[PDB]
TrEMBL record, chain A:
It comes from Bacillus anthracis (anthrax bacterium). The lineage of its organism: Bacteria, Bacillati, Bacillota, Bacilli, Bacillales. AMP binds at G84, A111, W179, E268, A302. This is Microcin immunity protein MccF. Gene3D superfamilies: Class I glutamine amidotransferase-like (3.40.50.10740), LD-carboxypeptidase A C-terminal domain-like (3.50.30.60). Residues 12-131 form the LD-carboxypeptidase N-terminal domain. Keywords: Hydrolase, Nucleotide-binding. Belongs to the peptidase S66 family.
TrEMBL record, chain B:
Disulfide bonds join C304-C305. The active site is at A115, E238, A306. It comes from the Bacteria. Pfam families: Peptidase_S66, Peptidase_S66C. The keyword Hydrolase applies. Residues 206-321 form the LD-carboxypeptidase C-terminal domain. Belongs to the peptidase S66 family. The keyword Nucleotide-binding applies. GO terms for molecular function: hydrolase activity; nucleotide binding. Keywords: Hydrolase, Nucleotide-binding. InterPro entries: Carboxypeptidase_A_C_sf (IPR027461), Class_I_gatase-like (IPR029062), LdcA_N (IPR027478), Peptidase_S66_N (IPR040449), Peptidase_S66C (IPR040921), S66_fam (IPR003507). This is Microcin immunity protein MccF. Residues 16-135 form the LD-carboxypeptidase N-terminal domain.
Amino acid sequence: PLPKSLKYGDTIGIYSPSSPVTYTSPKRFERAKSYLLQKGFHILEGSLTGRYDYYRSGSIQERAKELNALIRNPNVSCIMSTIGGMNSNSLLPYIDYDAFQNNPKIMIGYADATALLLGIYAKTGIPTFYGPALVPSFGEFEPFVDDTYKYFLETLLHDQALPYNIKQPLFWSDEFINWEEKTKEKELRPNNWISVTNGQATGRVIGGNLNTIQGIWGSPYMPCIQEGDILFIEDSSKDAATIERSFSFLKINGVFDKVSGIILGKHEQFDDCGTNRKPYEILLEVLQNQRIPLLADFDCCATHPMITMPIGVQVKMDATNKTIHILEKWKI
Amino acid sequence: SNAMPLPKSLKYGDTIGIYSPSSPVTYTSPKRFERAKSYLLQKGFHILEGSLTGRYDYYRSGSIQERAKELNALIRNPNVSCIMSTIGGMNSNSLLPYIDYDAFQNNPKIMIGYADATALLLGIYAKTGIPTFYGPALVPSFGEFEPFVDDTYKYFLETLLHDQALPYNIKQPLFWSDEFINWEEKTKEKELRPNNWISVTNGQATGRVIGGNLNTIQGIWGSPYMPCIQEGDILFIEDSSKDAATIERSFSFLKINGVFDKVSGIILGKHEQFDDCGTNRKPYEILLEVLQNQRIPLLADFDCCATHPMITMPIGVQVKMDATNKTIHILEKWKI
Ligand SMILES: Nc1ncnc2c1ncn2[C@@H]1O[C@H](COS(=O)(=O)NC(=O)[C@@H](N)CC(=O)O)[C@@H](O)[C@H]1O
Ligand SMILES: Nc1ncnc2c1ncn2[C@@H]1O[C@H](COS(=O)(=O)NC(=O)[C@@H](N)CC(=O)O)[C@@H](O)[C@H]1O
């Protein structure tokens, strides 16, 4: 069971499972919609679009209803979060997994939406996509939005012969500017994926936003991590203390006794608490010299631009030579 | 309900060993640290300062291995009767693979603290079956100025040192505060707010109490260091200094894990400095939305959290909670 590839003229349904961004950042929201409309995709606005309930878009029931309406709509080919926040996991008991399994669609987003991407995969076995959310990703100004868009097409729309090589972008940024309105150009940071621990691994890739995983761990909505899986994790806009807790959470759960390799995303606006340590160095301390191939600063996180990564399919990573290939089909 | 290994009661003149499993508070808040030690020394206890006392590694007291060594030296020391965290932070869970649980099992002690120290309290209980205590940490709890420190000390003594007939009634404190003042130095008196517990959903429950700091539980969940929640348990949870979005996440985390299908009742701590995000909702109101149509007896604003004063609560022993009448009784021995 796999979702159909996106096509020009398709409808993308958008929903707000957590923060009410369509109310609080209307300019970036409108820009994001226009960007995709111009590319050739229709936008179906979920029922909580424009609504405000302070830290969230609406009640648990209303958010589940918003998403379920899109799941059940045969005219929708792709379901995309508007943004994350903290509260997507509240929806999980109430989602119509059977409707999704009977008519698979592309489910895409990142950050807090991890709860839903992993929950849908766990319940249905259908691959989901760690990738753009409407407002942060497609509301981005030039130049980075165009790079994110190229990666979006590469994974969801283009015919891709396997293995599918995921290529490193030339430049990136995590600069905290140009949210609603553009005031200057973001700096172009020359890119590098980091060969932290050499080696190669092949296996099913599982993961997403690590902070968010801790809100679903142990539940029926968290796919079981199996011996030989590849772990993909990122955090964004946290600090050294928080990520040490999260890395140790994985360690004490035996995750590093099972996975064959680790892909670690860049950490947007990382606060190192004065230590001058990088996120991978904190992970290395937690690993205590266990030799697991580890490739870091992967561009699939809150930094721009963003790759669209299938979750739940076989991948091969090479931490030595800094490559990632998708080995198993993820769409029709 | 067979008799089981229990730690020995605290006695006057006992040595309390202190360690810093996360934040380096003994370096960054020296006045409150000195005041806290001085408070317990005046009551006639001795303080053995762990090896990371006074040390500084930014967000933590030292490396993972340095912090495990610090705690293990106290665990292995037969002259220590009580092991108390200086403060929490975020990183206690890093220590868990490296703790000498065998040595603890061989010579049990009172293990006490709160907040991030939940990782260790629950880890020790999960690995050894010895009850541990959600209660004072040295600097936040015993560095508090009068009057609240005396109430916290009263509860500590009554639970850990005094003989208690069972069932043991946990008395409601008469006053409380969560004011963000008087940390290192006193500038005014904290308001003495008249206290109440809240009967959120009526009813009674009896069972083993399991829990602690909910945010911290998410850093150990699923591991050998989290005790399994069983049918009929009473869930004790608190969060401190968080916001509505964060606690909804944490309550839903419990829900989707089936915790509310198992527990017979819930005790919710006060929420120090809660940020309601403009909603004007109370933490229990958010929890009740997560509970949806499921009725569970619930007693809220319990004084076992970051607000002052603090009760000392044994974890892993049977309790009766009466949410209707706002009582908590401990039903099984927690020390000998
Ligand atoms: N007001 C604003 N201004 C500028 N940038 C913003 C913004 N709001 C969002 N962004 C940007 O959009 C990204 C995604 O936002 S997010 O709400 O979905 N985040 C999460 O769900 C995880 N934190 C969940 C977790 O950490 O557990 C942020 O990292 C910023 O880059
Ligand atoms: N610098 C300071 N100034 C004033 N009060 C302070 C303080 N530092 C601490 N406090 C007080 O001491 C309490 C406990 O701090 S703590 O580091 O142990 N917290 C935790 O481990 C959890 N947050 C882990 C989690 O939520 O995941 C705080 O709530 C304050 O009331």
